[PDB]
């Protein structure tokens, strides 16, 4: 199978992941079938033990992975559904080899980092390239590999040795190489320098790889004498020094690389069966990148969250949301409100943090409550859901918002004010949200409801059955532990809020739809991760179709 | 003698020379006596065979050096007068050792680049540190050394080996080390990274030097957690990671390093006799850097030249000129006019390049004609000097402008139109500007008039004797070959233009002063290189005192 | 033209020059025409200003070069006659570029070590590869290049950069690469390690070359799992890790590389027109390497010299001498006698150094007096030439021995005891050996008689005309300044010693032949450098044909 290894150059925050995924979008739209194996230098096996603030935004796969943020970038720029071993971290090999040396699967033999780690990386990438990562069951054709972290650092050393020997496991005509590099410049001088691109490739050749492409990233597009300079010091023709300047969007990055004629390069370098025509489906990525800059209308919806800033921590949500806003022709102004700032605590001790966050909630024409774990920042979002019910703003709750809306509906329309969850003050007077972990035969104890499960509708007049396309069942990614108590359906028999979503065996309720309000829905699943920039996530479309008035006319065609 | 070795880090155009000279200005203004030995990676022995366009601006010393542009930066930030061996280039050692291996001064012994080049660098810097580079004859106390070019390049390899062994020739407490480094950042992210500072110091330690200071250069001032990161990977305390951001002037660079507390560092690192008080003369550099930003008035003088742009090529002139403009409180708008664009050739073939350059000459209230060699761009400047004589704008001619003004005065007030030079159409009908090279006993042939020579005034009503301070003689740097013909003094006996300057033995005329015009003077010497930012060059002051009307009131006190 | 670049690996004294010349002997004996350009890291332009003790043995070319010892190794393993620019030293480029920057042949432009040195190396090797280095005037076909010194040292840095860019000036199929490496082992362990071969190639790839062959040099032949290890870490198939163990001779090194199948490798790597047959003339090198180990007879001749040991300093002579001893089937025991130890000084102050050196002279059956400059060690060799005349041992004088024999013949058969040279106590009572430098039109002053000149015989009964093949004239390399005085032919008209050799214009006498003694001849030229291992140098053959009695029977067929 053909292999494309991107690898970093001078510094860290270049944009490997937008380069590596945009090599995917080209060869996805050339007809070829693409996988993606993002290498990670960090140690976190089954990575989602993080704090989303740090790191950012634990991503969820179909099988139940707790996988890196930047693996979500492949499942949008392609329609790929990745697997939990289709990520690979440093502490995933070292756990895989320590588990093999204690079984005795090496027969003594004094296991080493060469070759017994570098074989374990190469056995990994020979296998996860083969698994059909599209829904179409067929062996794939290329494999973009993203070696995270820079080079010359001391986590590249187990991996660039592993891909040093991997040039010759495959043939020369099966293994390309991308080296994304920083080409800085100073302001008042204008000279666009490229010393560190020289000293990074010299560090790269000493590690055993030579760049086939050298993707220089700058502020302005690099001069034609600059790429003539890199051609002499980095052993490649000047047609292969691709620039990528300060792009105004991520959607322009695939159409920018195509005009740099990379499609013609991978035709001869990897001998791929592209063909020679209009070189991709330019009619999708450019046809929306023209729409992304042509945005002058505003659907400024709010997003109350547990965290102080958008150091990303909701990248996924943000992304789904735009995906809707690209299909409605609206520049989305995401007002990020901290949930702590709306509490009763804040107005006593610090009114400026209080009122400035509330003022954003008043001007907003959509509240989104995403997922989250813990008592922290909970009591603020309970004020915001009451602001959606008593002032008629479109609302969407995701995996905690569905839980907290059903809690506050009992507090404010049923006056069951003592009802709470069991995550929150666990010895519950009225146990409305209880714990109910899963029991799948094959593990021990209470497992999280995690992965693709089935969700069955109940009624016919569902505003989500209108959006998903009148289908009986949907499949979305779950990540939680808790449910609404089935012994509180008795208190929910006739009033405004009712249940629409339900799983297979019926013990757990999924989707709510409040009456006499254009949009008040809450989901147990995460609608984010099934979105693409082609098809929006259907709950996120209805949150923006109701945030601009088009929710009426959308449901008349 | 104490030694300070600055050395470059990530890229080329950082600003070694403004860092290395600002370490000079601190220790000049701490009471210590400073030298400067700029290393150069290039090969040009007796360097001024360049084209000023390329490179830029051949600088002139007292003894007759043809020395680098960036050695002029030391003779302004200090009152130092440098010597021609106080520069050192790669092709100056290799010529010095090839000349010694052919005499036999090594006694066979198979001379090598280690040690016989690295000794020749160390014998050089042990000697030129000792020579009193100030006018005060006394052995100096420190020696700033500027290793030009980056590190890890293959000209550092002869020199960083030469300073590797030079740590131990001197004691530990005689040899500091500065490593100026690039700390880039990307725009929309804000992360201020410092990977290449790590990999440059690792390259530096492998070459045998460890940084005592690490001067990180960025756009914004670097965060206090960023310099905490460099402290762990580059083996120095966090108080020694000095930042230098996008400075608005070069004069702020010395006062910016002082607030980073470098004076306290070199007190303990080098055991220098500074003292503890107001740590420098802050009352000079800050007291003009406040004046440099407080400039709202304009003295927009023109500068017609042979070259297409100010890729620097007149840095010296530019610099002298501001030095005057700092003392007059005027932001100098240097309009750079190309001499080719004012010719009769240009208006025929390309009127836009013609009129846009002339339009600058009409709005200007000062014409400066600097030095230059050749027929190219000569006929354009002859139109501009006629524009100074027939429209009464203050004028200054420097070393070709003095020659061309005396030529055009004969063409337009004496109607000796056939008179020209002997550089230009050499078989002269009327030889008004002839060749007259020097004959100093000790060389063979016609030497250039080059270096500090004596210039004696003739009259008493000189507008330059008013400016230099009524002195009988001045000493300025010469660099030319040609003179005005002494057999054309007969045609100059009584009219408007007369001669004021004269050398010792009287064969050669120096300085002219036209009557019935506030400022029309021309000099054979170069007034630029004797200027400081404290004392302006006195011809350049009179070109700006007449460009704002203050030439009257300056000569009444 | 095809190019083969050998380059050193771990340490210095590996044997580049025996590897690089043995690649020559293969492709010489495959039918191809070979040149040789030995790079040198040292600085000595026109290198023979050395002391032969240091360094060793200034070699002489046809045109008048004063060239490295190790360029003589190419003129024996091939019949090549090298040129003085067909060597290249570091101080030959730097002098070539400093001479071009002062003429102005770069037009300013700020000459640099990249590219203006690396172009000057590549312009050099593109030119001296083209010059026909064989006597057959025809453009050659390959070019062995010996980059002296190790790699990662800071003289490789100007040259491995120069051959980094030179991979792409030529095509991929015109530039091979040899990397000769050290594979050490420890005694009692037996493990044959190859860590430094890995870290040298990683240093080599970071410099920009990849090894096509990796010639590992050890004590024992390296194991077949060791070359399997280098194949994974140095990017070449295991058939290309050539071993070379502790060879018993230098003549086995060409036939050892052939059995490692290098001829089959350069057929596909460089696409050379070899053919497929008996892969070389194995019938020459193996057919004498079998003769070199089959030597049990002894022709132990003496060699009195100015130097304390054979740190080589007479490599050339030594080599010529064996070349004769291979054709006589005698293991040559070269007894090296110091000339100082035979003096009257030594027996007074130190009898052990005296008698042990004389005892060697008494047992010896041949005295050779080679060339040399100076009064030092002269009076000892005058005792040894008297030991050849008064005790009838075969003698040969070379370029000082011809001078000193004619001196001592006047002292001991003519009793002109006051006669001496003019090098020695220059105000000569009887000037028998005077100075007579050449006057070639094109230089100034007294030039050395240097290079190929013509030597014309005088008589018919010459024991050298018997040896050279009854030819009228011979051509041999000269390197001296002095002659025998033509005004002392009057004192030489009739006695035992007479003159046989003579130049063209007759002023200078060359070759002497003493009567009533089987072999007492002396030459002004150096017979050494025209020898091969196929044809011996004809004076050195007659010194060994008379040292074993076969001088009679050789001259009867
Ligand atoms: N890879 C390199 C590049 C340059 N040099 C030497 O360093 C000098 C130029 O240094 P620098 O400005 O750092 O190289 P540039 O390529 O000009 O820098 P940039 O990458 O900003 O263009 C040249 O004379 C050259 O001899 C070197 O030894 N090795
Ligand atoms: N000198 C270093 C720095 C980092 N790392 C590894 O690389 C990862 C981080 O890489 P990078 O982002 O390049 O390092 P930072 O210092 O975070 O980058 P910056 O200089 O931009 O702060 C860390 O997990 C660390 O294990 C390393 O091996 N060697
Ligand atoms: N660290 C070094 C050592 C030597 N050289 C250069 O390489 C030549 C000598 O090379 P080499 O023999 O490898 O160095 P030695 O120290 O003599 O080798 P050894 O370690 O065997 O003594 C010298 O002219 C010197 O200019 C260099 O650039 N860097
Ligand atoms: N294919 C993609 N789709 C969507 N977002 C992306 C994609 N690639 C990168 N991004 C986002 O853009 C930012 C670019 O930084 P990134 O490429 O992650 O830096 P690095 O090169 O260190 O991985 C990231 O924070 C990431 O969240
Ligand atoms: N001490 C100084 N005085 C005046 N001008 C200076 C001084 N130092 C630098 N400059 C000018 O400012 C610019 C800064 O670039 P420079 O420091 O020369 O880069 P580099 O670090 O590659 O030498 C130079 O072009 C130089 O002309
Ligand atoms: N082709 C050759 N012919 C004759 N003698 C040689 C040849 N090559 C090397 N030698 C001799 O054998 C010795 C081997 O060392 P050498 O190859 O010179 O080490 P290095 O690899 O450092 O040049 C040298 O001293 C040299 O005199």
CSV table of N, CA and C in Angstrom, one decimal, chain C residues 391-468:
chain,number,residue,atom,x,y,z
C,391,UNK,N,86.1,-0.9,-1.1
C,391,UNK,CA,85.7,-2.2,-0.7
C,391,UNK,C,84.8,-2.9,-1.6
C,392,UNK,N,84.5,-2.2,-2.8
C,392,UNK,CA,83.9,-2.8,-4.0
C,392,UNK,C,82.5,-3.4,-3.6
C,393,UNK,N,81.6,-2.5,-3.2
C,393,UNK,CA,80.2,-2.8,-3.0
C,393,UNK,C,79.4,-2.1,-4.1
C,394,UNK,N,78.3,-2.6,-4.7
C,394,UNK,CA,77.5,-1.9,-5.6
C,394,UNK,C,76.9,-0.6,-5.0
C,395,UNK,N,77.0,0.5,-5.8
C,395,UNK,CA,76.6,1.8,-5.3
C,395,UNK,C,75.7,2.5,-6.3
C,396,UNK,N,74.8,3.3,-5.8
C,396,UNK,CA,74.0,4.2,-6.6
C,396,UNK,C,73.8,5.5,-5.9
C,397,UNK,N,74.1,6.6,-6.5
C,397,UNK,CA,73.9,7.9,-6.0
C,397,UNK,C,72.8,8.6,-6.7
C,398,UNK,N,71.9,9.3,-6.0
C,398,UNK,CA,70.7,9.9,-6.6
C,398,UNK,C,70.7,11.4,-6.1
C,399,UNK,N,71.1,12.3,-7.0
C,399,UNK,CA,70.9,13.7,-7.0
C,399,UNK,C,71.6,14.5,-5.9
C,400,UNK,N,72.2,13.8,-4.9
C,400,UNK,CA,73.2,14.3,-4.0
C,400,UNK,C,74.3,13.3,-3.9
C,401,UNK,N,74.0,12.1,-4.1
C,401,UNK,CA,75.0,11.0,-4.2
C,401,UNK,C,75.8,11.1,-5.4
C,402,UNK,N,75.2,11.5,-6.5
C,402,UNK,CA,76.0,11.8,-7.7
C,402,UNK,C,77.0,13.0,-7.5
C,403,UNK,N,76.5,14.0,-6.7
C,403,UNK,CA,77.3,15.1,-6.4
C,403,UNK,C,78.4,14.8,-5.4
C,404,UNK,N,78.1,14.0,-4.4
C,404,UNK,CA,79.1,13.7,-3.3
C,404,UNK,C,80.1,12.7,-3.8
C,405,UNK,N,79.7,11.8,-4.7
C,405,UNK,CA,80.7,10.8,-5.2
C,405,UNK,C,81.8,11.5,-6.0
C,406,UNK,N,81.4,12.5,-6.9
C,406,UNK,CA,82.3,13.2,-7.7
C,406,UNK,C,83.2,14.1,-6.8
C,407,UNK,N,82.7,14.5,-5.7
C,407,UNK,CA,83.5,15.3,-4.7
C,407,UNK,C,84.5,14.4,-4.1
C,408,UNK,N,84.1,13.2,-3.6
C,408,UNK,CA,85.0,12.4,-2.8
C,408,UNK,C,86.0,11.6,-3.7
C,409,UNK,N,85.7,11.5,-5.0
C,409,UNK,CA,86.6,10.9,-6.0
C,409,UNK,C,87.8,11.9,-6.2
C,410,UNK,N,87.5,13.2,-6.2
C,410,UNK,CA,88.6,14.1,-6.2
C,410,UNK,C,89.4,14.1,-5.0
C,411,UNK,N,88.8,13.8,-3.8
C,411,UNK,CA,89.6,13.8,-2.6
C,411,UNK,C,90.4,12.6,-2.3
C,412,UNK,N,90.1,11.5,-3.0
C,412,UNK,CA,90.7,10.2,-2.7
C,412,UNK,C,91.4,9.5,-3.8
C,413,UNK,N,91.2,10.0,-5.1
C,413,UNK,CA,92.0,9.4,-6.2
C,413,UNK,C,92.7,10.5,-6.9
C,414,UNK,N,92.3,11.8,-6.8
C,414,UNK,CA,93.0,12.9,-7.3
C,414,UNK,C,93.7,13.7,-6.3
C,415,UNK,N,93.4,13.5,-5.0
C,415,UNK,CA,94.0,14.2,-3.8
C,415,UNK,C,93.8,15.8,-3.9
C,416,UNK,N,92.6,16.2,-4.5
C,416,UNK,CA,92.2,17.5,-4.4
C,416,UNK,C,91.3,17.7,-3.2
C,417,UNK,N,91.9,17.6,-2.0
C,417,UNK,CA,91.2,17.5,-0.8
C,417,UNK,C,90.5,18.8,-0.4
C,418,UNK,N,91.0,19.9,-0.9
C,418,UNK,CA,90.3,21.2,-0.6
C,418,UNK,C,89.1,21.4,-1.5
C,419,UNK,N,88.8,20.5,-2.4
C,419,UNK,CA,87.6,20.7,-3.3
C,419,UNK,C,86.4,20.2,-2.5
C,420,UNK,N,85.3,21.0,-2.7
C,420,UNK,CA,84.1,20.8,-2.0
C,420,UNK,C,83.0,21.3,-2.9
C,421,UNK,N,81.8,21.6,-2.3
C,421,UNK,CA,80.7,22.2,-3.1
C,421,UNK,C,80.7,23.6,-2.8
C,422,UNK,N,79.7,24.3,-3.4
C,422,UNK,CA,79.4,25.7,-3.0
C,422,UNK,C,78.1,25.7,-2.2
C,423,UNK,N,77.4,24.7,-2.0
C,423,UNK,CA,76.4,24.6,-1.0
C,423,UNK,C,77.0,24.5,0.4
C,424,UNK,N,78.2,23.9,0.4
C,424,UNK,CA,78.9,23.5,1.7
C,424,UNK,C,80.2,24.4,1.7
C,425,UNK,N,80.3,25.2,2.7
C,425,UNK,CA,81.3,26.3,2.9
C,425,UNK,C,81.5,27.1,1.6
C,426,UNK,N,80.5,28.0,1.3
C,426,UNK,CA,80.3,28.4,-0.1
C,426,UNK,C,81.4,29.2,-0.7
C,427,UNK,N,82.2,29.9,0.0
C,427,UNK,CA,83.4,30.5,-0.5
C,427,UNK,C,84.4,29.4,-0.7
C,428,UNK,N,84.4,28.8,-1.9
C,428,UNK,CA,85.1,27.6,-2.4
C,428,UNK,C,86.5,27.8,-2.7
C,429,UNK,N,87.4,27.1,-2.1
C,429,UNK,CA,88.8,27.1,-2.6
C,429,UNK,C,89.0,26.5,-3.9
C,430,UNK,N,88.5,25.3,-4.1
C,430,UNK,CA,88.4,24.7,-5.4
C,430,UNK,C,86.9,24.4,-5.7
C,431,UNK,N,86.3,25.2,-6.5
C,431,UNK,CA,84.8,25.0,-6.7
C,431,UNK,C,84.4,23.9,-7.6
C,432,UNK,N,84.3,22.7,-7.1
C,432,UNK,CA,84.0,21.5,-7.9
C,432,UNK,C,82.5,21.3,-8.2
C,433,UNK,N,81.7,21.6,-7.2
C,433,UNK,CA,80.3,21.6,-7.3
C,433,UNK,C,79.7,23.0,-7.1
C,434,UNK,N,79.3,23.6,-8.2
C,434,UNK,CA,78.9,25.0,-8.1
C,434,UNK,C,77.4,25.1,-8.3
C,435,UNK,N,76.8,26.3,-8.1
C,435,UNK,CA,75.4,26.5,-8.4
C,435,UNK,C,75.2,26.9,-9.8
C,436,UNK,N,74.2,26.3,-10.5
C,436,UNK,CA,73.8,26.7,-11.8
C,436,UNK,C,72.3,26.5,-12.0
C,437,UNK,N,71.5,27.5,-11.6
C,437,UNK,CA,70.1,27.4,-11.8
C,437,UNK,C,69.7,27.7,-13.2
C,438,UNK,N,68.5,27.3,-13.5
C,438,UNK,CA,68.0,27.5,-14.9
C,438,UNK,C,67.5,28.9,-15.2
C,439,UNK,N,67.4,29.2,-16.5
C,439,UNK,CA,66.8,30.4,-17.0
C,439,UNK,C,65.9,30.1,-18.1
C,440,UNK,N,64.6,29.7,-17.7
C,440,UNK,CA,63.6,29.5,-18.7
C,440,UNK,C,62.9,30.8,-19.0
C,441,UNK,N,62.7,31.2,-20.3
C,441,UNK,CA,62.0,32.5,-20.6
C,441,UNK,C,60.6,32.5,-20.2
C,442,UNK,N,60.2,33.3,-19.2
C,442,UNK,CA,58.8,33.3,-18.7
C,442,UNK,C,58.8,33.4,-17.2
C,443,UNK,N,59.9,33.2,-16.5
C,443,UNK,CA,60.1,33.5,-15.1
C,443,UNK,C,61.2,34.5,-14.9
C,444,UNK,N,61.4,34.9,-13.6
C,444,UNK,CA,62.5,35.8,-13.3
C,444,UNK,C,63.4,35.1,-12.2
C,445,UNK,N,64.7,35.2,-12.4
C,445,UNK,CA,65.7,34.7,-11.5
C,445,UNK,C,66.0,33.3,-11.7
C,446,UNK,N,66.7,32.7,-10.8
C,446,UNK,CA,67.2,31.3,-10.9
C,446,UNK,C,66.2,30.3,-10.5
C,447,UNK,N,65.6,29.6,-11.5
C,447,UNK,CA,64.7,28.5,-11.2
C,447,UNK,C,65.4,27.2,-11.0
C,448,UNK,N,64.8,26.4,-10.2
C,448,UNK,CA,65.3,25.0,-10.0
C,448,UNK,C,65.2,24.2,-11.3
C,449,UNK,N,66.2,23.4,-11.6
C,449,UNK,CA,66.0,22.4,-12.6
C,449,UNK,C,65.0,21.4,-12.2
C,450,UNK,N,63.8,21.4,-12.8
C,450,UNK,CA,62.7,20.7,-12.2
C,450,UNK,C,61.7,20.2,-13.3
C,451,UNK,N,61.5,18.9,-13.3
C,451,UNK,CA,60.6,18.2,-14.2
C,451,UNK,C,61.3,17.3,-15.1
C,452,UNK,N,60.5,16.8,-16.1
C,452,UNK,CA,61.0,16.0,-17.2
C,452,UNK,C,62.0,16.9,-18.0
C,453,UNK,N,63.2,16.5,-18.1
C,453,UNK,CA,64.2,17.0,-19.0
C,453,UNK,C,64.8,15.9,-19.8
C,454,UNK,N,65.5,16.2,-20.8
C,454,UNK,CA,66.1,15.2,-21.7
C,454,UNK,C,67.5,14.9,-21.2
C,455,UNK,N,67.9,13.6,-21.2
C,455,UNK,CA,69.3,13.2,-20.8
C,455,UNK,C,69.9,12.4,-21.9
C,456,UNK,N,71.0,12.9,-22.5
C,456,UNK,CA,71.6,12.3,-23.6
C,456,UNK,C,72.9,11.6,-23.2
C,457,UNK,N,73.0,10.3,-23.6
C,457,UNK,CA,74.3,9.6,-23.3
C,457,UNK,C,75.4,10.1,-24.2
C,458,UNK,N,76.6,9.8,-23.7
C,458,UNK,CA,77.8,10.2,-24.4
C,458,UNK,C,78.6,9.0,-25.1
C,459,UNK,N,78.9,8.0,-24.3
C,459,UNK,CA,79.7,6.9,-24.7
C,459,UNK,C,78.8,5.8,-25.3
C,460,UNK,N,79.4,4.6,-25.6
C,460,UNK,CA,78.6,3.4,-26.0
C,460,UNK,C,78.7,2.3,-24.9
C,461,UNK,N,79.9,2.2,-24.2
C,461,UNK,CA,80.0,1.2,-23.2
C,461,UNK,C,79.4,1.7,-21.9
C,462,UNK,N,78.2,2.1,-21.8
C,462,UNK,CA,77.6,2.5,-20.6
C,462,UNK,C,76.8,1.4,-20.0
C,463,UNK,N,76.9,1.2,-18.7
C,463,UNK,CA,76.2,0.2,-18.0
C,463,UNK,C,74.7,0.6,-17.8
C,464,UNK,N,74.4,1.9,-18.0
C,464,UNK,CA,73.0,2.3,-18.0
C,464,UNK,C,72.4,2.3,-19.4
C,465,UNK,N,73.2,2.5,-20.5
C,465,UNK,CA,72.7,2.3,-21.8
C,465,UNK,C,72.4,0.8,-22.1
C,466,UNK,N,73.2,-0.1,-21.4
C,466,UNK,CA,72.8,-1.5,-21.3
C,466,UNK,C,71.5,-1.7,-20.6
C,467,UNK,N,71.1,-0.9,-19.6
C,467,UNK,CA,69.9,-1.2,-18.9
C,467,UNK,C,68.7,-0.5,-19.4
C,468,UNK,N,68.8,0.7,-19.9
C,468,UNK,CA,67.6,1.4,-20.5
C,468,UNK,C,67.2,0.8,-21.8
